[PDB]
């Protein structure tokens, strides 16, 4: 009844860890009972996971759950490929992206690439789930293809949303300093997940799809282009050098070696200066 | 003879603090003489025959605090309910407020019910020292008893204090403002009562184009200055907060400089601790439109093409700080240094939210260029960096610091 709070999630990690040793069939049953509650809540942004601590507790709970409870990833995928009821408020965007990050870490740490891509193929989520137009509608107001392409376009649209919210958002009008800190921590977790996906070698199909998308264009403005993301990242140099370096690592992981980005963040030649730029 | 009155009103305080025979009826009604006497030595015609009274009241209280607290509480509530002499009332009231937090949460409802009449009564008391003691006693009493009132009782106390907001005494107006805000704050339904008091105060000045006294205006502006800090996220809405901002902007134009000072202090508290929705309205370009002479058109807070803070800064500058020529400072005879310092502080607090306002031309539609050669800029308030009195040079320094920080924060150092 109180599961939407991360302190209750800690109490459940304990309950689960002890029922694991008491009996491994009370364990799996309770793990199923918990996943079946949590995943729809994450889909609808009802969990209070708008903090670093709460997201970490959710991660370790997902790790403590019995694997059988998340074995068919149809539910994880249905609970991840969602849009929020609005993205005009910072808190809703943060809760939505936080639940997405939790489910995504689950997908890249407890499942394999082929299973996830097959299941995505069955339940045909579209890449246009969050297009630039859906994004711009949800920001103020409301209303075939390859599975790896859908997954990669989803993660890239998330990156673009997070960049736009970190760069173009006044620092105490719309969001507090804690909300800004969490936005940057969410972007860091997302970029680290992406680096693991492109660097580990266990997501070759997703990596190839992402390399194809990064070289693609704006389908009449339906998705974020690489130049748009890079223009947003170039403005984070003076404020968030760590996230910018993660973005550079991702650009190398997809072989974007254009000297429009590299000969400028490296200040390639032909007042003390800022330390973040250094 | 009075020396032995000091000796008696000190020896009763030498006896009861040391008997070890208490917790028995032989004590309570000797205490019923000690407290009724120490509170009588409190309204004495002689100075030190009252100071020994205060000292021994404090001794008897602090020595028997945990031992016989409820007895002392009743003994002080009685001399409050009596509505007696002023000095005795102050004594009993301030000593009862300092002990309110020691009442166990089963006697806060009887005590609140008994205290409501006494409080409404002593609010109608014309003495100024009584009003000071009440301004200090109302927050302490509410912070301990307000969770035990119903909304009707709280509204009774609130209407009891709203009346003093038109009083001619400044002490009485300040006590009213503070007591109303503190009553709203320490209530069960805090946000609803904040909105209720907002309704009452904005209703007290519904048409700004209508005579509203000078004393009522001062009282309402002070109450709003006290209430604005508490509005950091029914609940009060952008509608009435924007109406409060409009009221403040209108009353900075008043001809009485006390109303100008009150409105500048309200605008200061409103830019330094802005409710999160009024902030968004003031910084939004559409803004409110979507929901000492001026000499020219500076614009309207309802304009588009610019956020309302641009107009607010234009208003403050064109009113109290800039003539309209070029590097010409407004004399002190036209507007005093207090109003000038407060206007510079308000401009700094507004620039903290919206640096672009600092760079505006002083006038949207310029003054007639035949005689005024060059258009003045708001930024010329910086010429006050060498005004001549402190607190105006210091305010200009504060404004430069705030402006540097705000420009570096708005652009990502992409200055």
From Swiss-Prot, chain B:
The chain holds residues 95 to 787 of 3142 of the full protein. It is linked to Huntington disease: A neurodegenerative disorder characterized by involuntary movements (chorea), general motor impairment, psychiatric disorders and dementia. Onset of the disease occurs usually in the third or fourth decade of life. Onset and clinical course depend on the degree of poly-Gln repeat expansion, longer expansions resulting in earlier onset and more severe clinical manifestations. Neuropathology of Huntington disease displays a distinctive pattern with loss of neurons, especially in the caudate and putamen. Lopes-Maciel-Rodan syndrome: An autosomal recessive neurodevelopmental disorder characterized by developmental regression in infancy, delayed psychomotor development, severe intellectual disability, and cerebral and cerebellar atrophy. Additional features include swallowing problems, dystonia, bradykinesia, and continuous manual stereotypies without chorea. Some patients manifest seizures. The gene is HTT. This is Huntingtin. Coiled coil: none annotated. Belongs to the huntingtin family. HEAT repeats lie at residues 110-147, 152-189. Expressed in the brain cortex (at protein level). Widely expressed with the highest level of expression in the brain (nerve fibers, varicosities, and nerve endings). In the brain, the regions where it can be mainly found are the cerebellar cortex, the neocortex, the striatum, and the hippocampal formation. It comes from the Eukaryota.
